[PDB]
Design a protein that fits this description.
This is part of a larger assembly, with chains A (113 residues), B (244 residues), C (221 residues) and D (232 residues). Chain A is mainly α and 113 residues long. Chain A is built from five helices and no strands. The radius of gyration of chain A is 24 Å and the shape is elongated. In chain B, β5 and β6 form a beta hairpin. Chain B is an alpha/beta fold and 244 residues long. Chain B is globular, with a radius of gyration of 22 Å. With 221 residues, chain C is α/β, with parallel strands linked by helices. Chain C is 33% helix and 22% strand. Chain C contains eight helices and nine strands. A five-stranded parallel beta sheet of chain C has the order 2-5-8-1-9. Chain C has a two-stranded antiparallel ribbon with strand order 3-4. A two-stranded antiparallel sheet of chain C has the order 6-7. Classes of the chains: A mainly alpha (113), B alpha/beta (244), C alpha/beta (221), D mainly alpha (232). At the B-D interface, α10 of B face α1, α4 and α5 of D. The structure holds adenosine-5'-triphosphate, adenosine-5'-diphosphate and magnesium ion (2 copies). The site of one magnesium ion (MG) has 2 residues of chain B, from α4. The site of adenosine-5'-triphosphate has 13 residues of chain C, from α4. Chain B binds a DNA duplex (22 and 22 nucleotides) through loops. Chain C: It comes from Homo sapiens (Human). Chain C: This is DNA replication licensing factor MCM2.
DNA sequence: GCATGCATGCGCATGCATGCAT
DNA sequence: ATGCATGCATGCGCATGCATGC
């Protein structure tokens, strides 16, 4: 939040006081920014599943709002990926993965009906 | 809160009726309440009471009786409790959450004036050789029941706080009124589920009565007749339409 | 005397309302709707009472609910500064002015006094409440009776009194989970009860969506 | 309990136990009866009241002033108090017996314990209402008309609250719709309307059931408002 | 299973009133 | 004759025990 901005300003002032300089220069701001970033720790649980789910939700909601079935969705996703997959083995593996993910989303997560 | 020549009346009535004395006394207990002959007989037995016995070894045998009434709403239990309160000489009403264990049982307070510790009597201590009526008995907490257990067993209260210890007499009798856990008495379920009380508490009670509001047309007709006859009544010597 | 003429001349301006709306909270960036609602609350309305049977109040109570870091307290501080009779209090505790009336010997003057709540002291004024969801049972009951009946009844230490509490209430609050969820209703996102929410005329919802341009402008300010 | 009344659910909308409910003499239930023509009347009435509050404060048609009404009520309460008569007592006896028998029959047929029982307390409440009606006229004895009015009021309030054919018919429609619908299937509103009109049920009941299901969240709109689908 | 709300004893100092020993 | 120690509330600060609510 903005409290982080105030903390950054305070840390820059503290660093300037430490170095006895009369003005705040970008080095102190960079140090404060680095320290604040190192303070934050990411949560460990998966990202690929979230990205695929978000893409599916975005596509389905765009289709619904602008104006398909499960097979149509899978075909559209494969068509979009076409430029990214070079071999048939990877294509079929990704197809199985997305089919399982869609089944989980429809049945387990209840996100899609 | 006695006459002189009513002794002759008492002697004549006794020597005449003999066996019918108990039946007539039970029947005329409360005209305002219709039915419930066994409950009236039990209340009369409470009014009369048993005999306390003391033996050579100092053992004590209780002589008081305890009765618990359970039933559907609007079966005139609170009315009976109020009538007992009015008629009994030393009658004390104590509802479920109205008084706690410290109020029912005497306590110790340190006097600031002299620095000593004194005893303040509780509700049951005051009602020696009397009657204590407890409406909404089911709402009472477990600890209060445990405290009441000693009085119901031997009619004595033991108190001890460092520097003072005493035993007070609590030879009293208890009326209790409670509602079923389900609000209305379920006919199909066993009485154990409906009452929902531990075996020790029921055992320490002497009599258990179950009252039901059976919607029989003849009983309803008789009850309505009695209720409206009582409601239409006006005291003699009072002008009709007078306020109060 | 000349002030009245100046006010009348200002009222003749075609954009007086926009000027008044923009004047509130100069140090707070954005939130035009909040400022407009606060202006409407400050100007107020007119109570009505046909005979002595049906009373209708004219005060406009305002409730703001928002995520942390949205400067909810600054609006309350500015309103306290502007208002001639404004009483500020917090539901967290250790407030300078209490929210419940009581009779006590004052620690300073050592005299037997009856101190009323902030609602009574704010009669014909403004009452600002911060941390509206941290209140206890007594404060909630007092606020409910002051908002419904517009009066406070006291029965303590042999004293039985009824006091008027005609005031306008402005409150600030945060969501239950620390972040507003659009998928749920406003009632489900606040610890308050429906009858309390129903009293407020204006409800404002503040969110912290990441807009790079707005964030850059706020940082510059 | 749920914040707004659910007509089809009937009971379980009251959290109070039957014990505390037996003490109350009368229980009234108010619902938001949504009529297009009614809302306009309410809005116009409110606006007219707001406008006329500033100018005039006068009785509409012979209405008593607040102070006069207060003094009159106090005088009536202080002065006299009436009691019932024999014929009214017999009529009330017959009506109470019939009502209790009907309540027992309804409880047996519905196979569910009513949350609003009928006991001697209700009879005493009716007696009290009749006595109040007689007291209102300063008469020393009540008449049959007062008893009839008290019985009408007690019926309209208590029997309507407790018995809460329209609602049973709505329950029938709800059961039929639950049996016909399936999870994940789509149904057109016209199909439902045609199916239930061929069964000769009123359209308003169907619309009310659909609105209640929408409130609960079982029914959702797929394509605009023409086709519905079932959720849980 | 524990922290907290609500009495209650403990120890103390402080203020207001009065009653008379040096 | 006069100034002071004491009896009687009352605030202050504290610890301790009983009940309950999550
Ligand atoms: N629009 C804004 N313009 C200027 N400063 C802002 C703005 N929004 C937030 N701030 C700053 O954010 C800081 C956060 O403190 P502030 O008291 O305003 O927070 P708050 O919204 O009341 O938070 P809390 O939810 O913790 O009570 C303040 O120093 C304030 O100046
Ligand atoms: N058998 C009966 N005869 C006469 N009156 C009755 C009878 N049963 C109930 N009533 C009336 O109904 C009321 C019941 O109230 P109450 O005694 O408080 O019920 P409960 O004690 O079961 O809660 C009483 O005022 C009483 O006048
Ligand atoms: Mg009773
Ligand atoms: Mg704040």
């Amino acid at each position: 939040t903005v409290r982080q901005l105030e903390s950054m300003i305070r840390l820059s002032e503290a660093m300037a006081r430490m170095h006895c300089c009369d003005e705040v220069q970008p080095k102190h701001v960079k140090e404060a920014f680095r320290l604040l970033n190192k303070s934050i720790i990411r949560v460990e649980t998966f990202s690929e599943y979230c990205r695929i789910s978000n893409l599916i939700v975005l596509h389905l909601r765009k289709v619904e709002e602008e104006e398909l079935k499960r097979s149509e969705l899978v075909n559209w996703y494969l068509k979009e990926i076409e430029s990214e997959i070079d071999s048939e083995e990877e294509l079929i593996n990704k197809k199985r993965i997305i089919e399982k993910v869609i089944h989980r989303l429809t049945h387990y997560d209840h996100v899609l009906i | 809160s006695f006459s002189a020549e009513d002794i002759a009346k008492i002697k004549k009535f006794s020597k005449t009726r003999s066996k019918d004395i108990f039946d007539q006394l039970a029947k005329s207990l409360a005209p305002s309440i219709h039915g419930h002959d066994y409950v009236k007989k039990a209340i009369l037995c409470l009014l009369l009471g048993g005999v306390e016995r003391d033996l050579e070894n100092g053992s004590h045998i209780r002589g008081d009786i305890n009765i618990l009434l359970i039933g559907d709403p609007s079966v005139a239990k609170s009315q009976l409790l109020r009538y007992v309160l009015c008629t009994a000489p030393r009658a004390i009403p104590t509802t479920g959450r109205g008084s706690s264990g410290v109020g029912l049982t005497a306590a110790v307070t340190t006097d600031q004036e002299t620095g000593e510790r004194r005893l303040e009597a509780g509700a049951m201590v005051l009602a020696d050789r009397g009657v204590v009526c407890i409406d909404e008995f089911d709402k009472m907490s477990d600890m209060d029941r445990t405290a009441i257990h000693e009085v119901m067993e031997q009619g004595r209260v033991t108190i001890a706080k460092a520097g003072i210890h005493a035993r007070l007499n609590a030879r009293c009798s208890v009326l209790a009124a409670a509602n079923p856990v389900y609000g209305r008495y379920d006919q199909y379920k066993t009485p154990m589920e409906n009452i929902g009380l531990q075996d020790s508490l029921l055992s320490r009670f002497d009599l258990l009565f179950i009252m039901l509001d059976q919607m029989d047309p003849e009983q309803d007709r008789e009850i309505s007749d009695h209720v409206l006859r009582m409601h239409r009544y006006r005291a003699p010597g009072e002008q009709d339409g007078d306020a109060m | 005397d000349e002030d009245v003429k100046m006010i009348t001349s200002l009222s003749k301006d075609q954009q007086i309302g926009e000027k008044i709306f923009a004047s509130i909270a100069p140090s707070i960036y954005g939130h035009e709707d909040i400022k407009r609602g606060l202006a409407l609350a400050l100007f107020g309305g007119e109570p009505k009472n046909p005979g002595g049977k049906h009373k209708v109040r004219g005060d406009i109570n305002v409730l703001l609910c928002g995520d942390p870091g949205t400067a909810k307290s600054q609006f309350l501080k500015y309103i306290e500064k502007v208002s001639s009779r404004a009483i500020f209090t917090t539901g967290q505790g250790a407030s300078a002015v209490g929210l419940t009336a009581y009779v006590q010997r004052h620690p300073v003057s050592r005299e037997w006094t009856l101190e009323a709540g902030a609602l009574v002291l704010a009669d014909r004024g403004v009452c600002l409440i911060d941390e509206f969801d941290k209140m206890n049972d007594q404060d909630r009951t007092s606020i409910h009776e002051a908002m419904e009946q517009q009066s406070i009844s006291i029965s303590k230490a042999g004293i039985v009194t009824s006091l008027q509490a005609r005031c306008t209430v402005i409150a600030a609050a945060n969501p239950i989970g620390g972040r507003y969820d659009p998928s749920l209703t406003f009632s489900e996102n606040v610890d308050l009860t429906e009858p309390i929410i129903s009293r407020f005329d204006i409800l404002c919802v503040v969110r912290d969506t990441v807009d790079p341009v707005q964030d850059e402008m706020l940082a510059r300010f | 309990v749920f914040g707004r009344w659910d007509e089809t659910k009937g009971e379980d909308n009251i959290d109070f136990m039957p014990t505390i409910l037996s003490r109350f003499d009368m229980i009234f239930i108010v619902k938001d009866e949504h009529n297009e023509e009614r809302d306009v009347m309410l809005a116009k009435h409110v606006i007219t009241l707001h406008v006329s509050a500033l100018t005039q404060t006068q009785a509409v048609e012979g209405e008593i002033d607040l102070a006069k009404l207060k003094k009159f009520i106090a005088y009536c309460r202080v002065k006299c108090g009436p009691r019932l008569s024999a014929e009214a007592a017999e009529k009330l006896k017959n009506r109470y017996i019939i009502m209790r028998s009907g309540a027992r029959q309804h409880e047996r047929d519905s196979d569910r314990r009513s949350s609003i029982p009928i006991t001697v307390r209700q009879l005493e409440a009716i007696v009290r209402i009749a006595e109040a009606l007689s007291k209102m006229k300063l008469q020393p004895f009540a008449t049959e008309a007062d008893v009839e009015e008290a019985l009408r009021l007690f019926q309209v309030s208590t029997l309507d609250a407790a018995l809460s054919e329209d609602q049973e018919m709505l329950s029938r429609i709800e059961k039929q719709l639950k049996r016909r619908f399936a999870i994940g299937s789509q149904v057109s509103e016209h199909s439902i309307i045609k199916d239930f009109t061929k069964q000769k049920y009123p359209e308003h009941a169907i619309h009310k059931v659909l609105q209640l299901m929408l409130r609960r969240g079982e029914i959702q709109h797929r394509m605009q408002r023409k086709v519905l689908y079932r959720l849980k």
